[PDB]
């Protein structure tokens, strides 16, 4: 009923708008009521709130021009820097496609700055890569020295400045003043200062605060932050040890186990990533990350029925996407559940909300067509994958294969060149171009293409045979 | 595969393509004759049996069903 | 040998197919007829709107955007894919939002496309939006005389990241 | 009645003649909740800009 | 009898696909297609006062009729990006005769249809106007010795001293006869009230006054005694005259065979086993199948 | 049906209503003594509705009284001095009212009536936000209630008598309030993320027994006491789930990756553990023994309050209530329905219509293989040129642009005509001159 009471109830219920508006009203009506002020702050900052553990974002500057790793040639297995590319598709040369996109996945690192600007903006990130990673209250006006004396206002105002205004400098100033006031004996302000430092790029001054907070109160968030720091310094084994210490404190925490699995899967050790994802399953059994990762892995290691079980589980728990339904249609067609494939593909096409998702669904429908044995429907599906996303190297490769099957060698050559220019990390257009070049002579381009094939997927046997043939011809 | 899918006219036309295409394998003729017999036809089943015997080749099971359809026609 | 292991799911599903294979077969044939219908539909629509960057008159075009600032190098890779015949009369037009983007030369002619060679044709797009606002940019390759685009390409221009 | 007799030998390759490789079917990765919310927020900003 | 708001029927006769007397058509759209049935059959969707009717527009034999007192979840899916226009879809989720049905209606023409908004608006009006067409006990009908009127309602008469021949202590009440319902509320404990709408009344007579209600939604025998028999018969006359004048055109207050198997919301399941108590979880859980267990169903 | 909240007696509860936590209650308010439960629901309008579901129908609603002012909290307990019978306490912003739901029968099941008789009322000189109740101290056969004003003040009423009121120290917004009996302590979650436990005697005498800096602020706090083996204070933070010991430290904690709305630790099944029940803003219920997820099921609505009660000869029925009005009893669905396309025979493929369309489209396909005049006039005199462009249909998104040469320059380069109606004429005029 009353203004403040109803604003509180709205905020509790995650309205975040009715309480904000009613707070504007109650503030204009009575210029002296700080409860409504901090409540409007909370509503504002929680409309936009995002988990800081998951906000790991890396720009080109932080990839190339920010050096913080101690070693330079660490032993293989002690730094972050399965199905072969002949089975599991790849996003870059290494790091085949995953089952779960978090906003911190890397899937490689661009070498130079030229290598990074001249590459599709979502090749090493889960969002377009950057160069670096009226109003409510005016930040310059309010004096943090006054708010930091009272923590009830201090914590909410800090959350507002750090998560809404995104001004890490004023946030760190308020956090420093507030930690001064509280005589350095509350873990929360330590963790907030650590987050501010980690944003500013000072990973050791942030590790210091996370460590000083763990000594005060062992909480899941501090372990996740500290492992995030230890991974920013490129020390995966320190992070694994910290995670295991956390799991010693919290005997079954799913976030720690999933962090361990993410590390083991970024070190490209799927044998332990899958074991820790299986532990997460033994704990959660609705975990989207664990189920998607084990499901993809099962699909690609000659077990589409088990992957179908896992994705059907994701569908039972109320997930309704374009990716989920594409995956379901694929696992159905390959598990030989021919009665549930094409309806899942149509549902996926319905749910698609991009032009890359539509292109991927038409690409997979073209694969279903190729399997069914009709190259005309396959032709149309690959061409529609191109219509929906012109930079779809796989559609070009498969369409060129079908063309070369028809007899159109020049069409196939141009399409394979476009593909191998769009995705240089893909061995298939390189190998195809080299093969149909050697078939017609032109051993120069045949060799130039076999070399890039072997650069993309080196243990490929046919590429080795072709390279040896061409090197014999050269001598 | 179509005969066991409750779809026998497509089985007919598929067998028609098969017998027009195949020259030196009587198993196609034997299977078409068995389809015709089990369809109660039994008149062109002898035509299929004759096409088969014009092509003779003995699998261990290709003989028994052959001679059983034979004594039946 | 690394012959895979088949769990109970495989045997249960081959059992359900052994009992009820005819329903699966009929429903798959129905869904495949519907799929051919929808694919022919979408393909006819793309032919109608000239949305395909690959479709006599043998040509191919894709576009690349390079740059992260308020200025992007939009390079069009255009290729004549034929045994031996050049393509004389071609032009490229850009359809863009004249508020968000500033292209100096929208319309320009295309050189004699020697068969088998990739021609990269550069342009400089400039994000004019003072905020971060992206938009699509279409590229029509078409003969001079005719008025129906021989083909089209689409480019989702990335965010400005400028000022 | 008579069951349909079937061939038993099957078809075997005698040589590995080179062929053309197709790319492989792609399982689309599932987006996290935080990634979904970031995309939602940026799309909503673009939208509330477009309406003017 | 009225069934177009209470049931979800398939392959309806062209006489029942037509506007029931009290019904009014609200909106329509052509080229709507039926998904959750993968026949690819184009059709035509129609939103009426009481239900949504889809029919094939080429073979109108195959069609669907979904009532508003059966729909639980009506959602709109705006998707299908630039490849064509935004082919908006509609998702209806219903529970009829204890079975969950799901219908997907895809507007093939790429434009966004205004029908999907009128649908939800009229459904909201339907749900919010159930005091017109349903039986209610002990509800909130009286503000202060005075009835609370519906949107389309006029109170015709108000009789006093009306006893209730269903209790023994809280009896002396008041009787409001209206153009949409007859209500009785006690003098003391004004929370003891009954409201019977003419749609539910089947027969009014004297036996000392007896209302017999429709057995299709609960057959109650409500008896009220009035002191002067003259006023008794007068009220009987008024009530029956109002019932007949209402029956010719019902108000409804809305302000503004094996094919059904294909429309299962659950999927290959149409009945829930009996809910028992699970000692493992400590909650009520539906009876487990023979072989299955809770920890064997929870694991992946 | 697997992993769905299978429905039971359910009903929507008004016309654009508004409910919160503390509205939904579930107890034997009628004092039947049998053991069933009756669903009580207050509203932010005044509609105190009490139901006894019998699976909807019309016998379910015991009563639907409408009080003038909104109903913030509803509770059921021994709120009257002498009798040991459960009563119904209703809390509005500035009023506390304890009723007595007495039902008297009629000869027929639809002739029995129920009345709520006001057993007493207290005026509140402050605007309340919520309240809790218990045996303050060690008094037996009593449930005296503490009401938290929205400006941080615990006003304790021993039934029928305003006992006292103490200002909570250092609080701006109001938080969730709970009462522990194993420690005789009020427990709050203040605005500075501090879970604070005060002793009741220290409050009555007036400070803080203990504190714990959890990382956020709490929606609900449930001190569950069905088990006496070890008391534990459960806390639902706005991001994390906590179970705390009686001394103050964390017994365990889980980091939810979702936004919780309501939680309820119901009875436990194993030895030492406690089954708990948390609802998402993704309208999904999670059953967690300790921190291990034992089950998860999709709710119809985002619950604002969940309870688990025995309703009409069935134990452990889940009773959810939203803020729209969706009130629903439910059980958990444990049928792993087969994944198979339906074997319908009526629904077949209309091959004729579909084949006409397919032949049409295939015709366009096999055919693909085998209206605006622009005129420029240059004046004979920086010479001024004028371009006249005309149509014959209703063209749209028209753009005209002029390209002369590098040295030559134009004063106007682009002209945008959004729509021009049919057989109409547009005329632009620019001027070209040498620059260089």
Numbering used by the authors:
A (entry chain 8): 1 to 81, 90 to 141, 158 to 499
B (entry chain 4): 347 to 402, 408 to 424
C (entry chain 1): 425 to 479, 483 to 590
D (entry chain 0): 7 to 58
E (entry chain 5): 6 to 212, 219 to 267, 296 to 339
F (entry chain 9): 2 to 56, 63 to 213, 234 to 397, 410 to 420, 439 to 493
Paper lines:
The recruitment of the BBSome to ciliary membranes (where it binds transmembrane protein substrates) is mediated by a highly specific interaction with ARL6 (also known as BBS3). Here, we use single-particle cryo-EM to determine structures of the native bovine BBSome complex with and without ARL6 at 3.5 Å and 3.1 Å resolution, respectively. The structures reveal the mechanism of ARL6-mediated activation and provide new insights into the pathogenesis of BBS-causing mutations and the evolutionary relationship between the BBSome and other transmembrane protein trafficking complexes.
In the absence of ARL6, the eight subunits of the BBSome are arranged in two lobes that we call the head and the body (referred to as the top and base lobes by Chou and colleagues [Chou et al., 2019]). The head and body are connected by a helical neck formed from two abutting coiled coils, one from BBS2 and the other from BBS9. BBS1βprop occupies a special position in the BBSome, cradled loosely between BBS7 in the head and BBS4 in the body. Relative to the body, the head is more flexible and less well resolved, while BBS1βprop shows additional flexibility independent of the head movement. Within the body, BBS9 interacts with all other subunits of the BBSome. A crystal structure has shown that ARL6:GTP interacts with blades 1 and 7 of the BBS1βprop. However, this binding site is occluded in the BBSome structure, as blade 7 of BBS1 forms a continuous eight-stranded β-sheet with the corresponding blade of the adjacent BBS2βprop. A calcium cation can be seen bound to both loops, coordinated by a network of acidic sidechains and the mainchain of the conserved glycine.
